[PDB]
Amino acid sequence: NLFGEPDEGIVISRFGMHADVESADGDVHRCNIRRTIRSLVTGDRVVWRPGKPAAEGVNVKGIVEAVHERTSVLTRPDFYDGVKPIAANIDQIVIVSAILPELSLNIIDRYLVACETLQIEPIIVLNKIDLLDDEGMAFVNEQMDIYRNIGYRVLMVSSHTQDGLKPLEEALTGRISIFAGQSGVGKSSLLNALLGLQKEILTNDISDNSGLGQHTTTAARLYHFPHGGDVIDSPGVREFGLWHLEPEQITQGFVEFHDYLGLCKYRDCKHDTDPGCAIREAVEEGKIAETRFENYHRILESMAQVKTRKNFS
Amino acid sequence: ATVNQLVRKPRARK
Amino acid sequence: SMQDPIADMLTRIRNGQAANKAAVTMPSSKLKVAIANVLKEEGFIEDFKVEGDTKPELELTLKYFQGKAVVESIQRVSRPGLRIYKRKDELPKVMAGLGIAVVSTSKGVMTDRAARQAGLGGEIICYVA
RNA sequence: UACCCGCAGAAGAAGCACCGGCUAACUCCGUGCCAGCAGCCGCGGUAAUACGGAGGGUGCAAGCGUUAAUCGGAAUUACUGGGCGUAAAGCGCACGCAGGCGGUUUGUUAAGUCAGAUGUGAAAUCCCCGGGCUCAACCUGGGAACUGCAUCUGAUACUGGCAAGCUUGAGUCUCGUAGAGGGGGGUAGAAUUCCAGGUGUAGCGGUGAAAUGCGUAGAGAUCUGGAGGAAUACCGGUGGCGAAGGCGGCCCCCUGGACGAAGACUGACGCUCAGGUGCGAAAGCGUGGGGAGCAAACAGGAUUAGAUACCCUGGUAGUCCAC
RNA sequence: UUAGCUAGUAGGUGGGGUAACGGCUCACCUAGGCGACGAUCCCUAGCUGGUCUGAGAGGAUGACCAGCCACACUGGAACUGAGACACGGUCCAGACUCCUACGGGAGGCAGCAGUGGGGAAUAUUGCACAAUGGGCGCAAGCCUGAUGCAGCCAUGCCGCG
Numbered sequence: 001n002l003f004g005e006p007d008e009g010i011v012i013s014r015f016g017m018h019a020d021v022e023s024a025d026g027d028v029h030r031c032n033i034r035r036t037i038r039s040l041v042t043g044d045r046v047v048w049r050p051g052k053p054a055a056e057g058v059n060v061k062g063i064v065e066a067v068h069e070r071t072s073v074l075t076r077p078d079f080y081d082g083v084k085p086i087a088a089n090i091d092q093i094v095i096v097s098a099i100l101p102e103l104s105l106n107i108i109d110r111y112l113v114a115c116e117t118l119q120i121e122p123i124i125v126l127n128k129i130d131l132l133d134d135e136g137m138a139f140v141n142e143q144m145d146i147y148r149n150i151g152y153r154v155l156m157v158s159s160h161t162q163d164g165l166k167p168l169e170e171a172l173t174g175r176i177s178i179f180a181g182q183s184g185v186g187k188s189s190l191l192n193a194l195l196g197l198q199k200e201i202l203t204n205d206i207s208d209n210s211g212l213g214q215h216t217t218t219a220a221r222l223y224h225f226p227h228g229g230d231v232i233d234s235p236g237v238r239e240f241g242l243w244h245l246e247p248e249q250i251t252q253g254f255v256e257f258h259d260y261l262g263l264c265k266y267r268d269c270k271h272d273t274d275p276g277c278a279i280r281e282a283v284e285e286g287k288i289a290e291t292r293f294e295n296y297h298r299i300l301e302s303m304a305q306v307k308t309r310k311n312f313s
Numbered sequence: 314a315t316v317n318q319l320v321r322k323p324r325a326r327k
Numbered sequence: 328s329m330q331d332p333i334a335d336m337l338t339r340i341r342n343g344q345a346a347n348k349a350a351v352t353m354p355s356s357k358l359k360v361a362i363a364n365v366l367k368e369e370g371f372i373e374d375f376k377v378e379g380d381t382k383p384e385l386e387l388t389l390k391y392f393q394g395k396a397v398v399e400s401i402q403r404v405s406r407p408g409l410r411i412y413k414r415k416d417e418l419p420k421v422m423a424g425l426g427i428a429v430v431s432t433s434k435g436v437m438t439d440r441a442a443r444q445a446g447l448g449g450e451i452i453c454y455v456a
Numbered sequence: 457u458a459c460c461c462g463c464a465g466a467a468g469a470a471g472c473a474c475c476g477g478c479u480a481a482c483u484c485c486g487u488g489c490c491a492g493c494a495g496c497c498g499c500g501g502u503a504a505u506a507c508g509g510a511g512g513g514u515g516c517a518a519g520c521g522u523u524a525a526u527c528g529g530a531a532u533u534a535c536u537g538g539g540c541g542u543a544a545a546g547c548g549c550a551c552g553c554a555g556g557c558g559g560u561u562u563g564u565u566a567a568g569u570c571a572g573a574u575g576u577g578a579a580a581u582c583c584c585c586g587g588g589c590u591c592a593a594c595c596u597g598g599g600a601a602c603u604g605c606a607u608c609u610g611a612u613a614c615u616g617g618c619a620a621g622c623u624u625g626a627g628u629c630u631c632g633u634a635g636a637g638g639g640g641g642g643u644a645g646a647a648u649u650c651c652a653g654g655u656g657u658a659g660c661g662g663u664g665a666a667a668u669g670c671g672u673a674g675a676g677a678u679c680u681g682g683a684g685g686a687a688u689a690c691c692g693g694u695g696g697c698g699a700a701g702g703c704g705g706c707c708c709c710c711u712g713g714a715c716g717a718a719g720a721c722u723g724a725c726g727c728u729c730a731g732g733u734g735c736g737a738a739a740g741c742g743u744g745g746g747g748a749g750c751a752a753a754c755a756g757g758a759u760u761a762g763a764u765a766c767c768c769u770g771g772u773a774g775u776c777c778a779c
Numbered sequence: 780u781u782a783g784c785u786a787g788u789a790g791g792u793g794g795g796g797u798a799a800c801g802g803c804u805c806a807c808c809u810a811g812g813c814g815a816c817g818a819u820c821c822c823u824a825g826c827u828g829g830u831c832u833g834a835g836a837g838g839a840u841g842a843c844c845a846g847c848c849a850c851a852c853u854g855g856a857a858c859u860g861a862g863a864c865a866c867g868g869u870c871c872a873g874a875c876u877c878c879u880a881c882g883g884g885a886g887g888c889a890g891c892a893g894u895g896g897g898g899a900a901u902a903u904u905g906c907a908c909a910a911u912g913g914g915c916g917c918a919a920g921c922c923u924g925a926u927g928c929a930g931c932c933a934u935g936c937c938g939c940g
């Protein structure tokens with residue numbers, strides 16, 4: 001009770017019982033939430049009132065009353081958790097990966113399917129590239145040229161080398177960015193080399209395994225660019241929620257496969273066991289790499305095994 | 314239960 | 328083991344009374360005769376006989392109503408783990424005076440009704456309810 | 457001063473809490489899981505007797521509610537008057553001191569207990585019958601009570617002590633029977649793996665499917681021979697033995713308990729157990745041996761979103777023995 | 780989640796000591812004493828007749844009344860006297876405050892009220908020796924913040940309008 005001025009501000013982080021709300025000038029001011037709020041995410045503009053200070057100048061919390069409309073939203077379902085939004089109100093996502101512990105290609109493919117359902121442009125960014133040789137660097141560059149023909153910008157950086165940070169910052173100003181990736185892929189290290197942020201906490205960095213990666217940093221913490229825009233950190237995520245829509249939308253989740261539709265034999269096609277698939281003929285031609293095609297029906301065979309019990313929102 | 318047990322130690326009042 | 332033979336005596340009486348047994352036997356002693364003779368004179372049992380001199384064996388004849396237990400329940404009161412003694416005016420009654428309480432005093436074994444004219448107290452043996 | 461006479465006129469003299477149930481009393485409006493309420497149960501997002509207000513009522517009363525504290529309810533530390541197969545609880549088991557308890561017959565002691573009496577348990581408080589202050593509170597007469605303790609005289613059934621016993625408790629002997637009871641020392645034959653030789657050829661191996669691995673230096677398979685290690689098929693079964701954990705090829709040696717038959721014999725020698733004492737699955741630890749197979753960690757290959765686990769090919773510690 | 784404690788300690792002789800017995804004290808002699816029926820150590824607490832609760836057994840507690848013990852700023856010591864190791868007696872030390880001419884002295888409200896302070900919270904800086912009890916004295920008489928009273932505090936009980 002005894003609330004303050006209704007105004008518009010940006011929520012810094014989410015802590016369940018309360019949230020960190022930045023004001024219209026840059027004041028870190030933690031607030032709790034209203035009981036009728038169905039969801040609140042990182043970086044969501046809200047209506048809020050900063051309570052009332054009991055001591056003169058010393059206030060404890062305020063409240064967050066209302067939530068504005070969403071521009072975008074990042075909803076990923078989960079077994080026995082349901083559809084949960086992670087972040088919202090964003091224009092650009094930056095897929096951040098590293099060569100250690102692994103560099104998979106199936107982790108890349110289903111963020112592409114999600115961003116086609118959100119009208120967001122993902123950017124492939126590799127880290128930890130200073131540990132490889134030029135024979136190994138040329139092969140990973142060859143594996144990313146397939147991701148360059150399909151229209152996505154590929155910038156290959158390193159935190160301990162500061163290579164290619166300046167072209168990474170030029171296309172990133174004026175927008176908010178999720179640094180999506182797996183556990184221990186160099187998310188927190190790239191936050192240190194771009195921002196110049198306050199070095200007194202500067203992150204939680206424990207990723208030490210035998211051949212694996214650890215997710216030490218939590219869900220999302222908000223900061224600001226020196227030029228403009230916001231950053232959104234991501235958890236170490238190994239999950240794939242494809243409970244959203246039909247497999248017709250899986251065909252729309254890939255860029256170069258748009259221009260090859262309507263060219264096969266039948267009006268409906270599984271594209272794996274059907275004779276005369278023109279998409280399969282494009283892979284056999286070599287204009288589409290077979291790594292993407294074998295992973296494509298791996299997505300379709302994944303929906304033969306995730307669908308099994310049932311789930312609905 | 315035994316009376317001879319309570320000779321050594323009575324019932325412990327909380 | 329057999330450390331309270333009066334409690335062993337009351338165990339054999341209560342079982343055969345409920346299990347429709349016509350007659351029971353038990354090892355005899357001087358004190359078991361001094362209790363069963365009182366129960367014979369108070370209408371609870373019928374007769375008792377002695378058998379054997381180097382192995383004294385006491386016998387009791389049971390008693391029924393229409394096949395119903397005459398002695399419904401009996402309660403050993405004093406015991407070798409805890410002795411119970413009362414005075415001539417603190418003698419407890421059984422079922423407010425219906426049942427009898429066997430109390431052994433210096434004038435022999437008698438009831439609390441018989442201890443009023445005797446005016447003595449001592450050890451309570453059993454509540455013959 | 458109490459007390460009493462006289463005067464005037466209802467004149468000077470009633471509030472608080474509750475009202476969903478517990479727990480006495482019901483409707484209306486406002487508010488909209490917000491505000492609030494609340495000892496418990498839990499009430500209130502569009503009809504709330506539970507919030508706020510009004511009407512009316514109920515319970516008390518010159519007081520009424522609230523908070524804090526003690527006991528009762530609470531048999532919820534159970535002497536009266538609780539439980540321990542699964543709700544919390546029977547030590548993993550055994551020996552055994554102190555301690556508690558103890559068959560049967562007689563005599564004795566009168567310790568415990570019981571009977572009677574004396575002394576004492578200050579008064580006040582409480583209880584019984586009274587008296588007094590107009591009444592009550594309060595004050596007070598006497599009695600009872602203070603279930604206590606000490607001493608003396610008694611009774612001897614029970615408990616205790618002493619004395620003499622008795623044999624059914626508990627033990628002892630003989631003749632026997634059954635058993636994977638323990639310890640020690642030999643020994644057997646399959647099977648596994650390794651090694652040697654022979655014949656013999658393209659796969660063996662493994663899985664849901666494959667791969668790692670092995671093999672033309674001839675694997676695998678078969679046969680002969682040898683070495684080492686650990687375990688004992690069938691018998692073998694709610695079968696047996698042991699205090700328990702447990703214990704299984706055969707044979708010898710040492711040794712423990714259990715049970716039955718016929719008598720003889722000691723005469724309660726007994727039961728129980730806080731500390732104390734020993735045994736006590738497997739893992740693990742120290743020292744020195746030993747090494748097949750199996751197998752933490754780990755190696756490698758599939759699986760997968762990742763595989764750390766599952767699956768497979770290997771493999772150290774450990775599993776073996778002594779201390 | 781305290782198991783060993785104790786050398787004047789346990790006992791004896793002799794001397795000393797107090798009103799009385801006694802390691803109460805001293806020299807000597809003995810090595811015992813205490814203790815799983817709780818010695819010793821630590822923490823807490825005045826106790827009892829009682830009050831309250833409870834059908835009773837029990838349980839919690841010790842204000843007012845009465846009995847006893849301890850204490851009188853802290854610590855120690857002795858005198859006086861029949862009786863004190865002495866609440867309004869003394870001496871010494873420490874602490875605090877006051878007076879002072881700077882060298883010194885004075886003082887003990889846990890007596891009646893009353894102030895400051897603490898805390899949720901507890902009173903008038905009253906009257907009287909009329910009665911009762913006590914002190915002194917042959918008595919008269921004097922003294923008594925004991926006590927008898929009064930005021931404040933709906934603080935409790937009871938009664939009335």
Ligand SMILES: Nc1nc2c(ncn2[C@@H]2O[C@H](COP(=O)(O)OP(=O)(O)NP(=O)(O)O)[C@@H](O)[C@H]2O)c(=O)[nH]1
Pocket residue numbers: 127128129130131157158159160161181182183184185186187188189190204205206207214215216217218235236
């Ligand atoms: N050699 C090298 N190490 C790098 C580079 N970038 C990051 N690292 C190291 O990689 C580790 C992982 O970095 P970190 O940012 O913590 O990973 P993360 O993805 O944020 N982890 P999390 O999932 O917990 O948030 C760190 O030890 C960091 O120093 C790089 O370019 N080169």
Ligand SMILES: [Mg+2]
Pocket residue numbers: 187188189203204216217
């Ligand atoms: Mg991080």
Ligand SMILES: [Mg+2]
Pocket residue numbers: none
């Ligand atoms: Mg009602």
Ligand SMILES: [Mg+2]
Pocket residue numbers: none
């Ligand atoms: Mg109200």
Ligand SMILES: [Mg+2]
Pocket residue numbers: 502503
């Ligand atoms: Mg309404």
Ligand SMILES: [Mg+2]
Pocket residue numbers: none
């Ligand atoms: Mg009144």
Ligand SMILES: [Mg+2]
Pocket residue numbers: none
């Ligand atoms: Mg309470």
Ligand SMILES: [Mg+2]
Pocket residue numbers: 530
């Ligand atoms: Mg109780």
Ligand SMILES: [Mg+2]
Pocket residue numbers: 538539
């Ligand atoms: Mg119970």
Ligand SMILES: [Mg+2]
Pocket residue numbers: none
């Ligand atoms: Mg249980």
Ligand SMILES: [Mg+2]
Pocket residue numbers: 548
């Ligand atoms: Mg057991």
Ligand SMILES: [Mg+2]
Pocket residue numbers: none
């Ligand atoms: Mg005689």
Ligand SMILES: [Mg+2]
Pocket residue numbers: 579
């Ligand atoms: Mg009295």
Ligand SMILES: [Mg+2]
Pocket residue numbers: none
């Ligand atoms: Mg009297």
Ligand SMILES: [Mg+2]
Pocket residue numbers: none
């Ligand atoms: Mg009286």
Ligand SMILES: [Mg+2]
Pocket residue numbers: none
């Ligand atoms: Mg009257």
